[PDB]
Scaffold this active site. Structure first.
Site, PDB file in Angstrom:
ATOM      1  N   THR A   1       0.858  -1.227   0.000  1.00  0.00           N
ATOM      2  CA  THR A   1       0.000   0.000   0.000  1.00  0.00           C
ATOM      3  C   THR A   1       0.870   1.244   0.000  1.00  0.00           C
ATOM      4  O   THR A   1       1.884   1.296   0.692  1.00  0.00           O
ATOM      5  CB  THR A   1      -0.950   0.038   1.222  1.00  0.00           C
ATOM      6  OG1 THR A   1      -1.839  -1.082   1.165  1.00  0.00           O
ATOM      7  CG2 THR A   1      -1.793   1.323   1.272  1.00  0.00           C
ATOM      8  N   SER A   2       0.466   2.232  -0.787  1.00  0.00           N
ATOM      9  CA  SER A   2       1.110   3.537  -0.801  1.00  0.00           C
ATOM     10  C   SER A   2      -0.012   4.549  -0.724  1.00  0.00           C
ATOM     11  O   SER A   2      -0.876   4.588  -1.598  1.00  0.00           O
ATOM     12  CB  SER A   2       1.935   3.737  -2.076  1.00  0.00           C
ATOM     13  OG  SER A   2       2.832   2.656  -2.280  1.00  0.00           O
TER      14      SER A   2
ATOM     15  N   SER B   1       3.428   0.464   3.088  1.00  0.00           N
ATOM     16  CA  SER B   1       4.702  -0.202   2.792  1.00  0.00           C
ATOM     17  C   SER B   1       5.537   0.526   1.740  1.00  0.00           C
ATOM     18  O   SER B   1       6.758   0.606   1.863  1.00  0.00           O
ATOM     19  CB  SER B   1       4.450  -1.642   2.339  1.00  0.00           C
ATOM     20  OG  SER B   1       3.599  -1.677   1.207  1.00  0.00           O
TER      21      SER B   1
ATOM     22  N   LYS C   1      -8.973   2.555  -1.381  1.00  0.00           N
ATOM     23  CA  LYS C   1      -8.383   2.739  -0.052  1.00  0.00           C
ATOM     24  C   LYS C   1      -8.645   4.124   0.531  1.00  0.00           C
ATOM     25  O   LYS C   1      -8.291   4.378   1.687  1.00  0.00           O
ATOM     26  CB  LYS C   1      -6.876   2.497  -0.111  1.00  0.00           C
ATOM     27  CG  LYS C   1      -6.497   1.158  -0.717  1.00  0.00           C
ATOM     28  CD  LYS C   1      -4.993   0.997  -0.797  1.00  0.00           C
ATOM     29  CE  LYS C   1      -4.633  -0.341  -1.415  1.00  0.00           C
ATOM     30  NZ  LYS C   1      -3.186  -0.618  -1.249  1.00  0.00           N
TER      31      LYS C   1
END
Ligand SMILES: *[C@@H](CS(C)(=O)=O)[C@H](Cc1ccc(CN)cc1)NC(=O)[C@@H](NC(=O)[C@H](CC(C)C)NC(=O)[C@@H](Cc1ccccc1)N=[N+]=[N-])[C@@H](C)O
Ligand SMILES: [Cl-]
Ligand SMILES: [Mg+2]
Ligand SMILES: [Mg+2]
Ligand SMILES: [Mg+2]
Lengths: 241, 204, 125, 219, 196, 244, 243, 240, 195
Positions: free
Chosen positions: E1-2, E129, E33
């Site tokens: 995930t960013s 991450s 998200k």
């Protein structure tokens, strides 16, 4: 005669505490009215600020329960706020558990089932209020549902509540007997509010200024109350025809 | 250590033409030690039969529990419970101990008294229903029984044809399992007679 | 729970519910106890308003609390069963913890203590 | 297990295989994995079978009571929430992995629900041991706003991929087509494998088994 | 995930990738998200999907009930409710949440809530991450009071790099713009951002 | 507070009686008469239904005679709803005993249990007692055939023959007159019906106003059978005994 | 009859007589007032000096809630304290969850719902206090008054206790003569006067004046007590106006 | 707040009467007439939609409620009390029965469960009895078609046909004459509409009458409960 | 505790139970009676974890004695065993289970039959002609398989039991200090004082 102090049956099969709670309903001496348009549901109510020391902006018997649901109360303000807080809580919990906005009638039934409990259980008194819920439901369209201290509830085409409810009721009855439809055949809510005010003026026989009324309007996806100046614009339009 | 294979034993059930059969071995042990050769694993509540393999204390407990429940059922409903209804009752009862289960492998068998339809069913230890027409197997030699049943079985067998099928399925499966055998029982169940036969088998 | 104080003092220093409980005893069939030199005998009345009774199965008036102690009573029969059960349980609890059956005085003291407790507990008569 | 679902033009197509296993052994070759939630909502089930069965039944039961009180058809979001919030509460110990599909007043909706309580809202999903085989078919051939018989073929093709390539999956292909105008519960939709034919009759003749004693009781 | 949230002149913009992985399998490649807890208060979610979804639903409930009684909550209030859940249930949660919102009084605001349950008010925030790979880039390239187009490009370039290097991140770059004008949803596909 | 409205259901009168028990017995005295008669080879339960219309569905109706297990039945007099609460409790107690000891519950043990429940409502809790009197007809292998009764006080007693409900004074005299210890079931059937026929407040005793049952060991291989009589069977036994 | 013996019983009118009897206890108490000004609020109270043995300035009646809300009440003083203790719990739990200090309307309903709850059951007595309270929040100044029934409204000015009619008349003059508004320092002076004028209803015993205030400019939106020179200046202004 | 009412509000009076139950029955008497008739191939239940105002939408107020797919209920007496009994009846049919046995309860057992709830309001602490009498019609596989009445006491009785509330004495006499054991469902509906006309003062049509049936399966089964439409009632009123 | 045997003959049940009580390295007692009389015609021997054994036995004894007083009646051996099994079956899913194995030897006065029940700590009940708990059975069952007959006298039962104890004394590693033997028949319970 303790059958009149708590919610148990009298020899006639009657609950006197429920009946006396109905009488507390008119203690404010305020009349409310609710009607349905095509796209909207309008609720109007008398506003009385007898004391000059009162902040008139805080004197209100209309409540925003959810974004879609509005509730006008006929009865004393402490019980009104009791009912308002609970309805707000119930509507929020519903959306969390079931993932969609609580319908007007589902809330009305829920509040009615709570009111029923106070008529059967002795330690709890009934609330001395009549709750008129309004919305534009996404399934049923414009909706008016009303709850009382007995725990009774029903849907309405239009309704009226208060000391002079019978006069307003018959005025509305007579209009819908002519038009032969369940609603006000009007596009804009502005004109449905103008209808509501006009038919209250006729029924009660009193003229209104901007500060004598309190208006709530339900549309698709929002319920809102009108400001004094929004009502004034409404009153100007009535006078001009 | 593994509760499902301390005491050992097996149950198999089959359908036939207007009949069902359910059968079990008679062994109870403490792992290698054989203790009892009179430990029956098939019980009945009215005309519905229930076989139970697994941990013997739970076999006994569940039998006592389903007797309890089906007795109250009959008093309230004013009729004996049917196989379809009992199967759902077993499933419910097992799943209510989802996170502390009975270490058992139950098998329902019976004929629906109204429709006349032969019925069998099986469950895992937490109550998932195996709802198969042909046959249901359970116990420490379940793999062995699956193999015997798949090759021996065919549909619509007459009661005494079916007896030979289920008996040979049980006996030959049991003889390939250390923890099964020591005798066997076969119930042949028809709409209004039940024949219970004890089988002669090797006692090792 | 139901907490209501039913046994309470009155202005003259009487607990009426306790005194009315004695009236229930006064109504009950007569019971008598006579101790000899090497025995005790418990006599009990059976009212003959009730014939067509089955005397095999009708609750007998004398009850064994243990193999060495007996309890007879006068008053409400249903109430007596509650005292008899409690006494029988305590008799076995005493044997279990003291490794000796109850004395008659001990068993009496226990039953009497239960009776007392019901005269100053809320919600009970 | 291979369960899958797609959103097509008029609604939802759900799909499932029929193999129930206990380790490496096949206990049932034709078991039902597509469960009823409400008249307009169905649920394909993978993971722990008992958990899958009982979780769907409980939420179906609660939705039935909800729908009786409100007097209107239940929504997929409320099915989704009720499953989701329960599975979350049990922190993954209820091993239910669901493909939830149905048609609302608000249109068709498809969800994947995981044991830990996460849900994705998607146009196509796959779950179970055959999810990768089935997902390959969807990545190869899926497009939005498919016609009914096309979507049926794609889901059927995706379940088949699972059946043949995944050992956990097998038996027949069940479909469930849900639109505003109908609900089509197709069991079986396809029988991709014939039952193996046996060449011999191994059934014993009467009197072959050795009996000790007999008892007959009438009912 | 960013994920990231960046304040700018006219308000705040939230940005996120769309990849959700089960180990090396991409379970969902089109994940949303960026989730709405109020009209103009949104959050970026990282960590356990079950946990962040459960939290976001509870927050939405609390702010809905707040709004019923006390009117529109501040972005700070939303961040405090997120914090309260994350901090008090730190032992049972794995949630790294950025909270972003637009008031008219306060304008754009960004609050980050890392694993511990601490709150940190920042001009911009990065998380997930893939964020490790863009600390350098973001620190060098961020300015305060950027225009809308500059902030969209800053987020687009940043997450592009996060996606390039992080296997756990990927798919489309979603964004949500929060200004006085309203709420705008943006999407940017691989063919656009990979060639930057 | 609430004290103002409390009836105080669990107190003694100055005479040492329990008000509510006494008043519940008064309630029960108006209920339809139920009779139990114990013979050497079985037990008879007979009971009179009340009010009845021609439109009451009799064959699916049960207000008087209930089954607790395969060995024990009860005849009810009083509030039917109150009886059903107690009946379901008793039915459970019998199954709890069966589960624990793997033997059917002895009749007295079941009777004591229910009677102890009734007692509790007279001594604590502040609730009204159960307005119910039971006749228990049962068999076990210790005492054989047994008849008991319980009432709202929680007191129970054993009987050779007994009545509860309406006109018990008259009913008990008639039973005391014609009962004998060597009597048989077929004779007891006749005595029960003759007693109801004389004590009934109705004009005549008909099949539609009666519930009837027998507990016989009179079965093949010495096993106890409960027979709840069907409407047509009650009509036949009324013709046989010569009442209609 | 008997409808007035138990709390939460509706009389045949639709009234709760026990609540109306609580109002009598309020009417029996000393005079307290509240004045809404331009950017804040002022509270003042009459403290009867029963004896010379009372220590001056020590028996404080006005209570602070959180740091920005002032509460004053007339009637049964312990009941008022009980309500403020609850108010402090409500204001604490609000700030704990939502970070921001509790808004005044939000706070008003918290007290309102709690007081109303004590009219729902016969196992509790209604509050024997009318409570005047308020402060400064993000939306500006707010003054409230809360009765035994649970009824409350916003006010320009508020007054309760034995001298309430006297006070109300004086408050009504200020509302008429200052439509553009009253300053915080003016409101302190006026509050002193109004308590002094309302003291004619409790004229037997002499009294002690106590004033507090929240003002955005004068106190940074925090509740402070009026002390020393500013208090004496207000007393002097009040003494001059009665003479 | 302490719920201090831990004691019974229904107690035996010196005469053996339970006052509150009798008074609840008086409340039922004042309520609008409802009735039930059992045919060979079905059951019918019916009542008057007594509209509190003409502005009220009486379609929203359902006096006849589905409890299970094969069981329906109607009442006379206090509507809010009925509503909460229907809620509890629907729920208990799932919790204590469907979630256990995988099927809906038979009519008699669901009736028994409702009766139990009503009995408990007659003995528990701090509550009055329910002010309703119910008429529950239903079908199940092993008992067939059945019709039950449930009173405030908790007492229940099976009926071939009956009526409760306002004009019940007259209505029960009317049904006694017309009822036989060879009625078809259409014959029973006809008799229900005749019987109900006697107790209705004002308008008598499909909009002012509520009428439902337990009959054949309407397409695992279909539901046997069916509520008749406003049009379906009016059609049968022309052949009246 | 170590060795507990049981054998049901024609007209009686015989329970043999070791005398040794050993904690660790030391034999603390060589005269321990590992039995309780539950009722006049029902005896229960027991073996398992220290403390739990006696606590359980005495708890069962108390409950049966309570039943005996309440009903003025002796429960059948079948009923007592079913009660005991349920207590153990309840125990096994407790916070701390009773680690106790038992044999219940009883004479059913109604049926005029001796009855022997073997129940382990899990609640695994079986009626047997002869039974044992722990390692005892491994040696003894083969002897009893060979020599047992259902029509044996009490003296023949005791001789067969001597042969079991001799085999245990020969082949078992632990010195169990001999056995206390008790006979349960129509006349009640008595201890064989020389064995
Ligand atoms: C495929 C799931 S997978 C491994 O993801 O591919 C199927 C899905 C499914 C769904 C519903 C139904 C029927 N309602 C069947 C199948 N899942 C399984 O096959 C699971 N198998 C089981 O759960 C079996 C069921 C028995 C009846 C065959 N049970 C067991 O394997 C265990 C049960 C158990 C499960 C979890 C913890 C402890 C025990 N056995 N026993 N006995 C999948 C787990 O294989
Ligand atoms: Cl509700
Ligand atoms: Mg009340
Ligand atoms: Mg073998
Ligand atoms: Mg990548």
């Amino acid at each position: 005669g303790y059958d009149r102090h708590i919610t148990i049956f009298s020899p006639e099969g009657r609950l006197y505490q429920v009946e006396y709670a109905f009488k507390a309903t008119n203690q404010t001496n305020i009349n409310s009215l609710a009607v349905r348009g095509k796209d909207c549901t309008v609720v109007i109510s008398q506003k009385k600020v007898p004391d000059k020391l009162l902040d008139p902006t805080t004197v209100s018997y209309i409540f925003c329960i959810s974004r879609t649901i509005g509730m006008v109360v006929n009865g004393p303000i402490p019980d009104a706020r009791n009912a308002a807080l609970r309805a707000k809580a119930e509507a929020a919990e519903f959306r969390y558990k079931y993932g969609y906005d609580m319908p007007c009638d589902v809330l009305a039934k829920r509040m009615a089932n709570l009111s029923q409990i106070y008529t059967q259980r002795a330690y709890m008194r009934p609330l001395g209020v009549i709750l008129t819920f309004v919305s534009v439901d996404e399934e049923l369209g414009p909706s008016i549902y009303k709850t009382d201290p007995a725990g009774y509830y029903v849907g309405y085409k239009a309704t009226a509540t208060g000391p002079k409810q019978q006069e307003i009721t018959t005025n509305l009855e007579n209009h819908f007997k002519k038009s032969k439809i369940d609603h006000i055949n009007e596009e804009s809510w502005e004109k449905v509010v103008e209808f509501a005010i006009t038919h209250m003026i006729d029924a009660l026989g009193t003229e209104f200024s901007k500060n004598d009324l309190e208006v709530g309007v339900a549309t698709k996806d929002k319920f809102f109350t009108l400001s004094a100046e929004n009502i004034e614009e409404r009153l100007v339009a009535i006078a001009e025809q | 250590s593994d509760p499902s294979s301390i005491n050992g034993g097996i149950v198999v059930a089959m359908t036939g033409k207007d009949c069902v059969a359910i059968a079990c071995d008679l062994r109870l042990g403490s792992q290698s030690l054989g203790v009892s050769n009179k430990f029956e694993k098939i019980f009945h509540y009215g005309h519905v039969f229930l076989g139970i393999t697994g941990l013997a204390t739970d076999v006994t407990t569940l039998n006592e529990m389903f007797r309890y429940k089906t007795n109250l059922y009959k008093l309230k409903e004013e009729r004996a419970i049917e196989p379809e209804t009992f199967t759902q009752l077993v499933s419910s009862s097992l799943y209510e101990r989802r996170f502390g289960p009975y270490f058992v492998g139950p098998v329902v068998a019976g004929i629906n008294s109204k429709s006349g339809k032969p019925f069998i069913a099986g469950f895992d230890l937490i109550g998932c229903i195996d709802e198969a027409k042909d046959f249901i197997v359970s116990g420490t030699a379940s793999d062995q029984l699956f193999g015997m049943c798949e090759s021996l079985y065919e549909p619509n067998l007459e009661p005494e044809d079916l007896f030979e099928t289920i008996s040979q399925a049980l006996l030959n499966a049991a003889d390939r399992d250390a923890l099964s055998g020591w005798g066997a029982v076969v119930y042949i169940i028809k709409k209004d007679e039940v024949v219970k036969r004890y089988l002669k088998m090797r006692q090792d | 729970g139901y907490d209501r104080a039913l046994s309470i003092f009155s202005p003259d220093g009487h607990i009426f519910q306790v005194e009315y409980a004695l009236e229930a005893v006064k109504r009950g069939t007569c019971a008598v106890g006579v101790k000899g030199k090497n025995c005790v005998v418990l006599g009990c009345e059976r009212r003959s308003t009730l014939k067509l009774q089955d005397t095999r199965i009708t609750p007998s008036k004398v009850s064994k609390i243990d193999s060495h102690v007996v309890l007879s009573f006068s008053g409400l029969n249903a109430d007596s069963r509650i005292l008899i059960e409690k006494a029988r349980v305590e008799a076995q609890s005493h044997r279990l913890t003291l490794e000796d059956p109850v004395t008659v005085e001990y068993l009496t003291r226990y039953v009497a203590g239960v009776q007392q407790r019901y005269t100053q507990s809320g919600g009970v008569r | 297990t291979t369960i899958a679902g797609v959103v097509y033009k008029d609604g939802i197509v759900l799909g499932a295989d029929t193999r129930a296993t206990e380790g490496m052994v096949v206990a049932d070759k034709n078991c039902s994995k597509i469960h009823f939630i409400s008249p307009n909502i169905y649920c394909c089930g993978a993971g722990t079978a008992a958990d899958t069965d009982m979780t769907t039944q409980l939420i179906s039961s609660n939705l039935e009571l909800h729908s009786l009180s409100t007097g209107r058809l239940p929504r997929v979001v409320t099915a989704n929430r009720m499953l989701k919030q329960m599975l979350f509460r049990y922190q993954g110990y209820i091993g239910a992995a669901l493909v939830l599909g149905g048609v609302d007043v608000t249109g068709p909706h498809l969800y994947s629900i995981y044991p830990h309580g996460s849900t994705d809202k998607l146009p196509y999903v796959t779950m179970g041991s055959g999810s990768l085989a089935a997902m390959a078919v969807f990545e190869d051939k899926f497009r939005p706003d498919m016609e009914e018989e096309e979507a049926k073929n794609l889901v059927s093709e995706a379940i088949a991929a699972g059946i043949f390539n995944d050992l956990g999956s097998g038996g027949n292909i069940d479909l469930c087509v849900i639109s505003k105008n109908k609900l089509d519960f197709l069991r079986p939709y396809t029988v991709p494998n014939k039952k193996g034919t046996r060449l011999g009759r191994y059934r014993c003749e009467k009197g072959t088994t050795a009996v000790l004693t007999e008892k007959i009781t009438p009912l | 995930t960013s994920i990231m949230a960046v304040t700018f002149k006219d308000g705040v913009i939230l940005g996120a990738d769309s990849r959700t992985t089960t180990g090396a399998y991409i379970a969902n490649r089109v994940t949303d998200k960026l989730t709405r807890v109020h009209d103009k208060i949104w959050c970026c979610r990282s960590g356990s999907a079950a946990d962040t979804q459960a939290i976001a639903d509870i927050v939405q409930y609390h702010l809905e009930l707040y709004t019923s009684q006390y009117g529109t909550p501040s972005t700070e209030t939303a961040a405090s409710v997120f914090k309260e859940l994350c901090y008090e249930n730190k032992d049972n949660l794995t949630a790294g949440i950025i909270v972003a919102g637009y008031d008219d009084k306060n304008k754009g605001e960004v609050y980050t809530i890392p694993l511990g349950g601490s709150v940190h008010k920042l001009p911009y925030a990065i998380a997930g991450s893939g964020s490790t790979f863009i600390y350098g880039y973001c620190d060098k390239n961020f300015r305060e009071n950027m225009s809308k187009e500059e902030t969209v490009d800053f987020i687009k370039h940043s997450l592009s790099q996060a996606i390039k290097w992080d296997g756990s991140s990927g798919g489309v770059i979603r964004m949500v713009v929060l200004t006085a004008a309203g709420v705008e949803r943006l999407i940017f596909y691989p063919d656009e951002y990979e060639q930057l | 507070g609430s004290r103002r409205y409390d009836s105080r259901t669990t107190i003694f009168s100055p005479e040492g009686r329990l008000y509510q028990v006494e008043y519940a017995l008064e309630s029960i005295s108006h209920a339809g008469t139920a009779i139990g008669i114990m013979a050497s080879d079985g037990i008879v339960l007979a009971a009179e239904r009340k009010v009845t219309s021609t439109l009451l569905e009799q064959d699916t109706s049960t207000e008087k005679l209930y089954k607790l297990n395969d060995k024990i039945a009860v005849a009810v007099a009083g509030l039917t709803a109150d009886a059903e609460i107690l009946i379901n409790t008793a039915r459970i107690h019998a199954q709890n005993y069966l589960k624990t000891y793997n033997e059917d519950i002895p009749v007295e043990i079941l009777v004591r249990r229910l009677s102890d429940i009734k007692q509790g409502y007279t001594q604590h809790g502040g609730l009204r007692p159960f307005g119910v009197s039971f006749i228990y007809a049962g068999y076990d292998d210790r005492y054989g055939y047994q008849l008991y009764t319980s009432n709202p006080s929680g007191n129970y007693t054993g009987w050779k023959a007994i009545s509860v409900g309406a006109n018990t004074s008259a009913a008990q005299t008639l039973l005391q007159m014609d009962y004998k210890d060597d009597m048989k079931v077929d004779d007891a059937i006749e005595l029960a019906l003759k007693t109801l026929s004389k004590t009934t407040d109705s004009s005549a005793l008909t099949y539609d106003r009666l519930e009837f049952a027998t507990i016989r060991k009179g079965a093949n291989d010495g096993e106890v059978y409960q027979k709840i009589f069907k409407p047509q069977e009650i009509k036949d036994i009324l013709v046989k005994t010569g009442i209609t | 009859t008997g409808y007035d013996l138990s709390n939460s019983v509706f009389s045949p009118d639709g009234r709760n007589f026990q609540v109306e009897y609580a109002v009598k206890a309020v009417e029996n108490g000393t005079t307290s007032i509240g004045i809404k000004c331009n950017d804040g609020v002022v509270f003042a109270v009459e403290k009867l000096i029963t004896s010379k043995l009372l220590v001056p300035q020590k028996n404080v009646k006005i209570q602070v809630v959180d740091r920005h809300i002032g509460c004053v009440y007339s009637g049964l003083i312990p009941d008022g304290r009980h309500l403020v203790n609850r108010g402090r719990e409500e204001a604490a739990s609000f700030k704990k969850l939502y970070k921001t200090p509790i808004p005044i309307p939000a706070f008003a309903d918290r007290l309102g719902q709690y007081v109303q709850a004590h009219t729902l059951y016969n196992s509790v007595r209604p509050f024997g206090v009318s409570t005047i309270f308020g402060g400064v929040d993000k939306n500006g100044a707010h003054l409230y008054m809360l009765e035994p029934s649970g009824s409350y409204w916003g006010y320009k000015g508020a007054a309760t206790g034995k001298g309430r009619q006297s006070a109300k008349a004086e408050l009504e003059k200020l509302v008429d003569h200052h439509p553009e508004g009253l300053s915080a320092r003016e409101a302190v002076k006026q509050a002193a006067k109004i308590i002094y004028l309302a003291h004619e209803d409790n004229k037997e015993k002499d009294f002690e004046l106590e004033i507090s205030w929240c003002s955005l400019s004068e106190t940074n939106g925090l509740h402070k007590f009026v002390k020393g020179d500013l208090l004496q200046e207000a007393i002097d202004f009040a003494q001059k106006e009665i003479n | 707040m302490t719920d201090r009412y831990s004691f019974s509000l229904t107690t035996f009076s010196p005469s053996g009467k339970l006052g509150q139950i009798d008074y609840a029955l008086t409340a039922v008497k004042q309520g609008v007439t409802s009735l039930g008739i059992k045919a060979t191939n079905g059951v019918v239940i019916a009542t008057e939609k007594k509209s509190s105002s003409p502005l009220a939408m009486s379609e929203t107020l359902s006096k006849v409620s589905l409890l299970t797919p094969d069981i329906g209920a109607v009442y006379s007496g206090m509507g809010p009390d009925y509503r909460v009994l229907v809620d509890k009846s629907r729920k208990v049919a799932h919790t204590s029965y469907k979630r256990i046995y995988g099927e809906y309860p038979p009519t008699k057992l669901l009736v028994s469960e409702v009766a139990k709830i009503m009995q408990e309001a007659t003995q528990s602490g701090g509550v009055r009895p329910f002010g309703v009498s119910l008429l529950i019609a239903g079908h199940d596989e092993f008992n067939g078609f059945s019709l039950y009445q449930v009173d405030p006491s908790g007492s229940y009785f099976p009926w071939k046909a009956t009526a409760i509330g306002k004009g019940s004495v007259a209505a029960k006499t009317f049904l006694e004459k017309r009822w036989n054991d060879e009625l078809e469902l259409e014959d029973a509906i006809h008799i229900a509409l005749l019987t109900l006309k006697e107790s209705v003062e004002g308008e008598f049509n499909g909009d002012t009458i509520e009428l439902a049936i337990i009959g054949d399966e309407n397409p695992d089964k279909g539901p046997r409960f069916r509520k008749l439409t406003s049009q379906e009632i009016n059609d049968r009123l022309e052949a009246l | 505790m170590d060795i507990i045997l049981g054998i049901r003959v024609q007209d009686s049940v015989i329970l043999a139970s070791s005398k040794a009580v050993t904690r660790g390295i030391s034999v603390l007692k060589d005269s321990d009676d590992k039995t309780r009389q539950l009722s006049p015609h029902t005896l229960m021997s027991f073996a398992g974890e220290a403390g739990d054994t006696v606590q359980f036995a005495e708890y069962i004894q108390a409950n049966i004695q309570l039943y005996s007083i309440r009903e003025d009646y002796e429960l059948s051996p079948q009923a007592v065993s079913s009660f005991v099994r349920q207590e153990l079956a309840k125990s096994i899913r407790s916070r701390r289970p009773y680690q106790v194995n038992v044999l219940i030897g009883g004479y059913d006065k109604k049926k005029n039959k001796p009855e022997l029940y073997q129940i382990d700590y899990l609640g695994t009940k079986v009626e047997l002609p002869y039974g044992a708990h722990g390692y005892s059975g491994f040696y003894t069952f083969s002897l009893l398989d060979h020599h047992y007959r259902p029509d044996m006298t009490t003296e023949e039962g005791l001789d067969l039991l001597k042969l079991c104890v001799q085999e245990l004394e020969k082949r078992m590693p632990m010195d169990f200090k001999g056995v206390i033997v008790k006979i349960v028949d129509k006349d009640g319970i008595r201890q064989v004082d020389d064995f």
